[PDB]
């Protein structure tokens, strides 16, 4: 028969837009950014099933802003908890912008 069609959802693009707008301030003020605190504060704004995607996208946006000078110290970072049910994150603080 004749060909049917199906459409995509843009929810994740919208999510990326909110996160990038919310995060732009850190660069502009060159404020030190800690992934642990930011993830813990930002996951509280969405329900549990969506946390994983939010974490991924937030990390994608955050890493573009500068580097963490501690990485050259030879000292590994710890696994910080960011919500209940037991999710963890590992990252040094971002200092060099």
């Amino acid at each position: 028969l004749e060909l049917e069609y199906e459409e995509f959802s843009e929810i994740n693009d919208q999510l990326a837009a909110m996160i990038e707008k919310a995060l732009l301030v850190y660069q502009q003020e060159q404020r030190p950014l800690d992934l642990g605190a930011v993830l813990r504060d930002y996951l509280a704004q969405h329900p549990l099933p969506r946390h994983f995607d939010v974490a991924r996208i937030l990390v994608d946006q955050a890493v573009r802003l500068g580097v963490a000078e501690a990485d050259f110290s030879g000292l590994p970072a710890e696994w910080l908890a960011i919500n209940d049910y037991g999710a963890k994150v590992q990252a040094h603080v971002i200092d060099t912008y």
Partner: protein, 233 residues
Amino acid sequence: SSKSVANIIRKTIQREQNRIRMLNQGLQAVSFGQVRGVRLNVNVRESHAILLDVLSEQQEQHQDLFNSQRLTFSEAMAKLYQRLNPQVDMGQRLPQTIGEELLDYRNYLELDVEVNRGSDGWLKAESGALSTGEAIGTGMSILVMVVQSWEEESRRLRGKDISPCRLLFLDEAARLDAKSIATLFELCERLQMQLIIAAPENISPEKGTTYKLVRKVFKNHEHVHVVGLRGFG
């Protein structure tokens, strides 16, 4: 002499067939595209089956060739094997070596890999007759077969309270669809076997640990920024 050798060979063959049959069951109902199962097909070569039967029951017809002290046992085995299937040729190699070949049980077995594809029955696994994902999945299946066999082999040389580690890789994992990845995760989990997979972000498996990589230039030198996530689910 004679019958007892046949019995030890038969029991060794039987034990190998049974162990393979046990390994075989762990791979039932694995979904990889249109492939729905994998097997290791084990069979006995005819030219050796008849030899084994003759050595079992017609020994009085050939005892001259066995008790002749001018030649050794392995030579006797080689000469009997040439007496049967006379069309076989020998490549100017010592009969001693052919005898020792007949003494090794593995030479009696024929081995194949088969897959239960789609509407069809069991087919021999040929790379050219499969899609990409089906080929990758079948490869993983055979690899876990090998690992299980090797662990069973060595345990008689290891401490009673030691269980070796098991780990395998997969590069360019984006080539597999979600259903195939679910199947692969189920297999490795049931086999207590660790996995490390690389994908250019196209796949986001919820279970396990994830590492985000970004390469940059810093003080005129290449540097990799790394972030990690885990615990979801």
